[PDB]
Amino acid sequence: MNIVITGAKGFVGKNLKADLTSTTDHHIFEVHRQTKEEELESALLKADFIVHLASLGNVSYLDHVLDILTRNTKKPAILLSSSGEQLLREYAEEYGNTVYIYRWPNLFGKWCKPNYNSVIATFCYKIARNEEIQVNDRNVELTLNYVDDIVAEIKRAIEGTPTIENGVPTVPNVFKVTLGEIVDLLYKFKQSRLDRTLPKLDNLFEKDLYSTYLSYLPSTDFSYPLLMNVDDRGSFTEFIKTPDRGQVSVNISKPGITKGNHWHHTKNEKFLVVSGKGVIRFRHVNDDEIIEYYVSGDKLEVVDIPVGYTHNIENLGDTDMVTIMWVNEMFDPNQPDTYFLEV
Amino acid sequence: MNIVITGAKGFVGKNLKADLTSTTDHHIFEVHRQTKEEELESALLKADFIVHLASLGNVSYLDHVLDILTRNTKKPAILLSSSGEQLLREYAEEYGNTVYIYRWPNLFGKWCKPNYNSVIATFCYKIARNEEIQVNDRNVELTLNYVDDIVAEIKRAIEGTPTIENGVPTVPNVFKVTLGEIVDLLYKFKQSRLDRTLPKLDNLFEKDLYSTYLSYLPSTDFSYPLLMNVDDRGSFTEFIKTPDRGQVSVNISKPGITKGNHWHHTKNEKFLVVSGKGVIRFRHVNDDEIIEYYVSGDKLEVVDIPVGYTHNIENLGDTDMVTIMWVNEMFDPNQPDTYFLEV
Ligand SMILES: [Zn+2]
Numbered sequence: 001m002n003i004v005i006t007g008a009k010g011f012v013g014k015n016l017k018a019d020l021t022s023t024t025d026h027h028i029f030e031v032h033r034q035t036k037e038e039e040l041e042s043a044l045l046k047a048d049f050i051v052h053l054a055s056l057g058n059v060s061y062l063d064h065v066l067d068i069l070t071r072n073t074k075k076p077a078i079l080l081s082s083s084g085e086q087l088l089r090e091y092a093e094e095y096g097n098t099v100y101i102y103r104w105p106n107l108f109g110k111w112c113k114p115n116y117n118s119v120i121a122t123f124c125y126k127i128a129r130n131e132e133i134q135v136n137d138r139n140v141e142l143t144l145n146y147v148d149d150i151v152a153e154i155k156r157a158i159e160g161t162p163t164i165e166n167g168v169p170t171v172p173n174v175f176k177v178t179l180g181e182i183v184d185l186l187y188k189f190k191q192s193r194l195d196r197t198l199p200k201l202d203n204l205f206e207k208d209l210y211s212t213y214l215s216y217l218p219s220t221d222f223s224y225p226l227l228m229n230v231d232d233r234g235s236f237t238e239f240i241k242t243p244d245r246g247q248v249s250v251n252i253s254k255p256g257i258t259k260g261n262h263w264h265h266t267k268n269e270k271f272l273v274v275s276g277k278g279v280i281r282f283r284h285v286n287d288d289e290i291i292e293y294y295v296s297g298d299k300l301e302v303v304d305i306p307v308g309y310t311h312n313i314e315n316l317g318d319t320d321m322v323t324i325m326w327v328n329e330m331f332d333p334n335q336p337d338t339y340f341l342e343v
Numbered sequence: 344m345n346i347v348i349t350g351a352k353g354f355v356g357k358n359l360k361a362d363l364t365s366t367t368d369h370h371i372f373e374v375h376r377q378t379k380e381e382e383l384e385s386a387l388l389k390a391d392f393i394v395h396l397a398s399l400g401n402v403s404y405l406d407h408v409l410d411i412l413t414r415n416t417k418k419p420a421i422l423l424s425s426s427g428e429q430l431l432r433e434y435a436e437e438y439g440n441t442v443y444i445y446r447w448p449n450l451f452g453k454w455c456k457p458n459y460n461s462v463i464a465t466f467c468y469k470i471a472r473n474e475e476i477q478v479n480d481r482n483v484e485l486t487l488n489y490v491d492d493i494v495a496e497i498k499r500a501i502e503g504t505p506t507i508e509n510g511v512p513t514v515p516n517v518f519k520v521t522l523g524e525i526v527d528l529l530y531k532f533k534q535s536r537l538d539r540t541l542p543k544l545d546n547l548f549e550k551d552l553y554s555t556y557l558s559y560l561p562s563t564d565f566s567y568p569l570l571m572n573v574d575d576r577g578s579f580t581e582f583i584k585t586p587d588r589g590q591v592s593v594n595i596s597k598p599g600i601t602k603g604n605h606w607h608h609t610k611n612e613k614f615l616v617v618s619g620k621g622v623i624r625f626r627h628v629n630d631d632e633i634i635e636y637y638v639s640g641d642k643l644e645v646v647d648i649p650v651g652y653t654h655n656i657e658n659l660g661d662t663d664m665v666t667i668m669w670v671n672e673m674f675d676p677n678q679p680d681t682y683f684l685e686v
């Protein structure tokens with residue numbers, strides 16, 4: 001299908017275009033402010049669908065586009081957002097085009113311009129760069145659609161099946177969050193480089209907000225150092241922490257090194273040797289028997305570390321053993337729940 | 344302090360003992376059914392604290408113990424659970440001992456006997472071994488204390504500061520869960536070896552139940568295989584998945600291998616190279632500039648993979664590169680949100 005996109009250089013425009021060239025075989029005709037009149041007319045005359053994203057006689061850009069479409073024999077469909085609706089209804093009646101009229105709320109997502117009156121864009125950009133932000137009123141209710149919903153809704157429309165809610169085409173998943181919640185979320189995401197915590201990804205708004213925030217990071221600033229606890233035996237490094245799904249860390253043991261020899265009451269772990277080779281050993285606290293699990297990066301398998309078994313880990317190889325360690329709780333030096341016991 | 348523990352071989356007994364020898368300097372005197380009368384008397388006569396866990400003339404074991412304590416000059420404190428209380432009150436009045444009287448509900452935790460009328464113990468044991476279980480009524484309300492609370496409460500009592508709730512010493516954190524919830528939890532924990540999901544660790548009951556379940560695993564059965572997706576370029580293996588904190592996986596690239604060259608709308612990642620050395624590269628979808636991040640296991644640092652940047656990963660070393668990959672969502676082959684783009 002020949003699809004034209006007006007205001008192609010805008011926020012939604014770039015998002016839709018990128019998506020449309022990647023996931024469909026439609027020919028996309030982009031039009032914008034520097035498009036020549038001969039190129040605009042040619043596009044609208046061969047279009048099958050028009051996504052419109054853009055008094056002394058001066059006619060609006062919109063009306064100019066509608067008057068040109070007047071001469072497209074194929075009565076192509078027209079999609080747009082209201083923010084003069086009655087005018088568009090009359091255009092559809094007279095010329096025959098199905099024209100989907102949406103009323104989008106405020107938007108957010110990647111590629112929106114910072115410091116040009118989209119308050120979310122500005123906040124992400126500034127917070128990622130440690131810049132003083134202005135919060136006029138934390139209690140202001142926002143009505144938002146994420147960019148992915150807009151884009152996904154437009155594609156439903158392109159195939160003749162748009163979401164209708166009470167007479168009008170309506171993009172699903174609108175959010176209502178106050179400004180304070182947004183700012184707090186933003187600062188929390190930045191803090192998470194320091195404390196290794198993760199966002200609440202089953203909160204749709206938050207997950208959407210986290211992705212959009214990342215997109216505003218300076219290009220020199222994608223990575224952050226981890227705190228390696230290094231000594232002559234190897235290193236132990238925390239990676240991610242969570243209050244509800246435990247935490248993962250990296251243990252590196254040099255050749256011939258044994259670590260552990262402790263047991264836990266309630267703390268438990270999952271060991272994944274991803275490089276090198278060695279043995280994970282267990283003895284029940286009240287018992288004689290030593291049980292050995294020989295493991296290596298050659299064959300990825302998790303060893304659960306059940307409660308009440310003392311356990312140790314040894315490198316048997318002539319290179320460093322690296323083990324991914326999941327633990328069921330964030331470690332607390334007050335209540336370590338770890339008791340030294342050999343074997 | 345000299346502390347004696349009656350019924351030392353029981354469920355709580357073994358737990359308390361293990362804990363007490365590990366975390367205090369008190370001398371623990373264990374007494375049980377095969378303790379000789381000369382050894383019982385010697386213990387109670389030198390005791391500072393007694394943790395009691397155990398008609399034609401026959402006197403109960405409890406009364407025997409109380410009559411012996413009658414001759415301990417030091418008026419030692421006595422702790423026990425009611426399930427003949429008025430009898431104990433009268434003993435304290437006459438002989439002077441502070442006697443803490445608890446009323447424990449049903450218990451659960453490691454080292455409780457399976458198939459001896461503790462229904463939770465039995466279920467864990469059977470489910471871990473793929474054994475037909477009997478569920479008489481899923482809707483039966485249980486009143487439970489975890490073993491760690493019992494043990495922690497006893498130690499508060501040993502130091503003269505027990506938790507009092509409305510006149511009585513009361514162990515905190517009692518649970519009310521139906522049998523159906525328990526069984527469902529148990530089967531879910533066993534299923535999680537197959538689907539790599541984790542329990543809800545901020546649910547205190549569930550976290551307590553998960554630890555207790557692990558403790559019943561056969562000793563040959565601590566580990567489970569992971570599904571490695573192997574080919575000539577390396578391997579990709581899922582490790583843990585969650586609906587709210589994303590998932591972690593292991594990518595292994597052989598020397599000179601490049602993987603990636605895609606971008607995402609909303610999916611984002613965290614790359615941790617834990618072994619080998621190479622480069623993670625980024626180009627903004629609408630842009631010329633290639634940004635390179637040189638990384639190695641020699642220095643653990645996370646690289647965030649922001650949305651809207653195409654990205655690839657290359658091994659530069661003469662050995663395998665292993666990268667831990669965190670992603671903000673479980674992968675869904677219907678909505679993969681990943682679009683091929685070079686560079
Ligand atoms: Zn451990």
Ligand SMILES: [Zn+2]
Pocket residue numbers: 605606607612648654
């Ligand atoms: Zn990716």
